[PDB]
């Protein structure tokens, strides 16, 4: 069978995360059941792993009482709680199926895998994002091609989509990545390639959807009248 | 656990003066730090009170044929003791956990970690709790206010291996005591010296 | 030298063996449960032997007392000394008549 | 920490590629079975051998899997263009009382050849001004690979604060583009002469400088 | 509180084969090393038999015990009766640290 996850979700730090393992069909309520966490720097480990049968938890000791896992069997779910958020726990975890079998060896095999969860916490949570239309200049355009766009600052949290005049454009759009700060603060770019005739007699709009705080701000885009 | 590249005596072993219980067949217990074998072979695991008796070789139970076989070449030396007050809590300690149903035996020395639910009738269940089918894994009854036959015990085994293979753990030559002012016989890793 | 064990025991005359303590050659000591609080057994290494003081004696203490070398402490004893016969009787000696 | 791997290994497309994993005599050597498995970037692990002597479904012959007492094995035949991926060694530690992963290795040689790059910039607009900060964006676009160092001068000492450098993503025609920032204020944006970012790849540097006045 | 359980009176024509129990009350009698002693009247006590299986070199081969762990019990078992048998039998327990006989 398949294992469907959530998404990626972000909190403070010093609350209490809360994800689900969803399975789909059944071979849910007879094996048992851990989870994995993935770390970019550094390798993986193994918090735990809880039987839903019995209901009882196995965790390793090199985790403290501070986690806990809880199993359903009324709708074969998983719930999972971890509260004392700290500064290293941008990673994303995994659902994961033990498959135990007869043999010398008896070691612990990970067949099958959930999708993944992308908790990140930080600081600078969740504010109004402001954008800054991009206009061209005289000396920045020499030929019949010109660069311009909409620079989008101070936006929580990830991921945020760029729309240009509602998807009418789709020839020389591009997107910029976020990047870290010294402030936890993210910037993108989006900029386009327009031929010099039509910025007299087509406007350029920019949509920014933004789903976790529900804005959606709409500015206009004008050409420097000074250069 | 694997002992290997590592030197120990096993008289600290015993003056503890806290175990319960102390069996050791295949040797006489006096004489097994002199002799030397290549590698020792140890396990750890919890047991009930009333199934320290069934950890001998030659009889048939449910948990010694189930769990962790014991064969007839069995030079092993085994120690279990109370530790109650911290393996135990109020409230249901049920965090161990055993094996109850098998579906035929198992070779010594061997471990299974098959969490397959084990079907009794002629029919498949398809891994769910209702009839013909039982789950195998079964959880304890330990509580720190029982009596003695029913207590959390600590039992593990340390075996010895002997095979074509020089001996790498195994007692060193012990300290003698320190005699002075008579005519003795001496050896200090260079001479063998005789004199006061 | 050897780190073995030292212990000592009684025995009535027509019953059985009564194990009464055990001490190593350092300060460790065990003693039973019924002997409880009234055994004292020291060891002087420099006279190279051990003795044991009991206290608040009576006539159910009459037996027959070894001391013996203890190689395995939950295991047999290899060597037995001869038993000192010790009566708990009377006030005073007095001469035959 | 138990378990170390070698950081990166180096192969050919048709020769035989092994990794060797080394770990203690309490979790590997002392009779529990091993388990590898591939980290894609971008999906989730999946199972590839366990116990280094059956083979799982979906799974090609090709991989093999060893233990030779201590440390264990895996041993391939071929590089074809999936194995962009981390593999790691997965066994029972007693001492942990649990499952501890490897380190990872990356298998990748070289596949960059070079291209030439172009940088444009753009200084802020009015209504970025009354915001109390001013970004300073230097783009680059048009270049390959993406391994572009990024330098601030302001024609007379160079800034080291607020620089920073995006990773590049590939475009629609396999090319990358970037952006760098800068953090300042407009108290000091107007009393400086001249701004510029500069940047250099495999050699060369080209320059680009605005005039606030 | 535990206690070994030895008949009091056994008796055996010589050249046959007898047996002699030692029951324990609550520890099972596996858990704990059972020594057997044979003690001449007017004279120490020796050890005849040990580790439940292993006999001391100097004592006769007959001298063999066995271990009942389901019946709490000690048995050792004495095949071929002769004169100089004719001795006190005592069997040996530790619990944990302190040593009770039979």
Not at chain 2, 2 to 19: G, K
Not at chain 2, 179 to 188: A, D, P, R, T
Not at chain 3, 37 to 60: E, H, M, N, P
Request: proline share 6%.
């Amino acid at each position: 069978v398949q294992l469907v996850e959530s998404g990626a979700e972000v909190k403070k730090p010093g609350s209490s995360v809360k994800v689900s393992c969803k399975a789909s069909g059944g071979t849910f309520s007879s094996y048992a059941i851990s989870w994995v966490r993935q770390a970019p720097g550094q390798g993986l480990e193994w918090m735990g792993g809880i039987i839903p049968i019995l209901g009882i938890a196995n965790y390793a000791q090199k985790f403290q009482g501070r986690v806990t896992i809880t199993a359903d069997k009324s709708t074969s779910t998983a719930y999972m709680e971890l509260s004392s958020l700290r500064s290293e726990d941008t990673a994303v975890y995994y659902c994961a199926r033990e498959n135990g079998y007869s043999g010398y060896g008896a070691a612990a095999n990970f067949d099958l895998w959930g999708r993944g969860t992308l908790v990140t916490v930080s600081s600078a949570s969740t504010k109004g994002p402001s954008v800054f239309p991009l206009a061209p200049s005289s000396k920045s355009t020499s030929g019949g091609t010109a660069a311009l766009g909409c620079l989008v600052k101070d936006y929580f949290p990830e991921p945020v989509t760029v729309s240009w005049n509602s998807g009418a454009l789709t020839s020389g759009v591009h997107t910029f990545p976020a990047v870290l700060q010294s402030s936890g603060l993210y910037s993108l770019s989006s900029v386009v390639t327009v031929p010099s005739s039509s910025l007299g007699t087509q406007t350029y709009i920019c949509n920014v959807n933004h789903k976790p705080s529900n804005t959606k701000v709409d500015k206009k885009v004008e050409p420097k009248s000074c250069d | 656990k694997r002992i290997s590249n590592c030197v120990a005596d096993y008289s600290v072993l015993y003056n503890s003066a806290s175990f319960s219980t102390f069996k050791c067949y295949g040797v006489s217990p006096t004489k097994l730090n002199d002799l030397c074998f290549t590698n020792v072979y140890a396990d750890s695991f919890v047991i009930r009170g009333d199934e320290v008796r069934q950890i001998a070789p030659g009889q048939t139970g449910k948990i010694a044929d189930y769990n962790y076989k014991l064969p007839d070449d069995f030079t092993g030396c085994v120690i279990a003791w109370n530790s109650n007050n911290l393996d135990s809590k109020v409230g249901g300690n049920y965090n161990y956990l055993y094996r109850l149903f098998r579906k035929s035996n198992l070779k010594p020395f061997e471990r299974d970690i098959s969490t397959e639910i084990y079907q009794a009738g002629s029919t498949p269940c398809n891994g769910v709790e209702g009839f013909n089918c039982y789950f195998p894994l079964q959880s304890y009854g330990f509580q720190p206010t029982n009596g003695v036959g029913y207590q959390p015990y600590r039992v593990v085994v340390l075996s010895f291996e002997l095979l074509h293979a020089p001996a790498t753990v195994c007692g060193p030559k012990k300290s003698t005591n320190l005699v002075k002012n008579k005519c003795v016989n001496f050896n200090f890793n260079g001479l063998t010296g005789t004199g006061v | 030298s050897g780190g073995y064990f030292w212990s000592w025991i009684r025995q009535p005359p027509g019953k059985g063996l009564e194990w009464i303590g055990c001490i190593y050659y350092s300060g460790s000591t065990n003693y039973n449960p019924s002997l409880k609080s009234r055994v004292t057994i020291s060891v002087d290494t420099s006279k190279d032997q051990f003795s044991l003081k009991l206290s608040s004696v009576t006539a159910a203490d009459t037996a027959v007392y070894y001391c013996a070398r203890q190689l395995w402490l939950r295991g047999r004893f290899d060597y037995w000394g001869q038993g000192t016969l010790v009566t708990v009787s009377s006030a005073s000696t007095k001469g035959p008549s | 920490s138990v378990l170390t791997q070698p950081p990166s290994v180096s192969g050919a497309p048709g020769q035989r590629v092994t990794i060797s994993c080394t770990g203690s005599s309490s979790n590997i050597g002392a009779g529990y079975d091993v388990h590898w498995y591939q980290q894609l970037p971008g999906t989730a692990p999946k199972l590839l051998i366990y116990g280094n002597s059956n083979r799982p479904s979906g799974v090609p012959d090709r991989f093999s899997g060893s233990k030779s007492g201590t440390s264990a094995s895996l041993a391939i035949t071929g590089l074809q263009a999936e194995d962009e991926a981390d593999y790691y060694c997965q066994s029972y530690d007693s001492s942990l009382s649990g499952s501890v992963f490897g380190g990872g290795t990356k298998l990748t040689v070289l596949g960059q050849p070079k291209a030439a790059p172009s940088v444009t910039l753009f200084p802020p607009s009015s209504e970025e001004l009354q915001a109390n900060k001013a970004t300073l964006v230097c783009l680059i676009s048009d270049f390959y690979p993406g391994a572009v160092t990024v330098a601030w001068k302001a024609d007379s000492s160079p800034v080291k604060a607020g620089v920073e450098t995006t990773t590049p993503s590939k475009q629609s025609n396999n090319k990358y583009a970037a952006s760098s920032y800068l953090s300042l204020t407009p108290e000091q944006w107007k009393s400086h002469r001249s701004y510029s970012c500069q940047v250099t790849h495999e050699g060369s540097t080209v320059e680009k400088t605005v005039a606030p006045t | 509180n535990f206690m070994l359980t030895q008949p009091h009176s056994v008796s055996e024509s010589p050249g046959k084969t007898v047996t002699i129990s030692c029951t324990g009350s609550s520890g099972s009698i596996a858990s704990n090393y059972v020594q057997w002693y044979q003690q001449r009247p007017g004279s120490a006590p020796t050890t005849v038999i040990y580790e439940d299986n292993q006999r001391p070199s100097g004592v006769p081969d007959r001298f063999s015990g066995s271990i009942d762990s389901s019946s709490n019990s000690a048995s050792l078992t004495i095949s071929g009766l002769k004169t100089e048998d004719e001795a006190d039998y005592y069997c040996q327990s530790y619990d944990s640290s302190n040593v009770v006989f039979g």
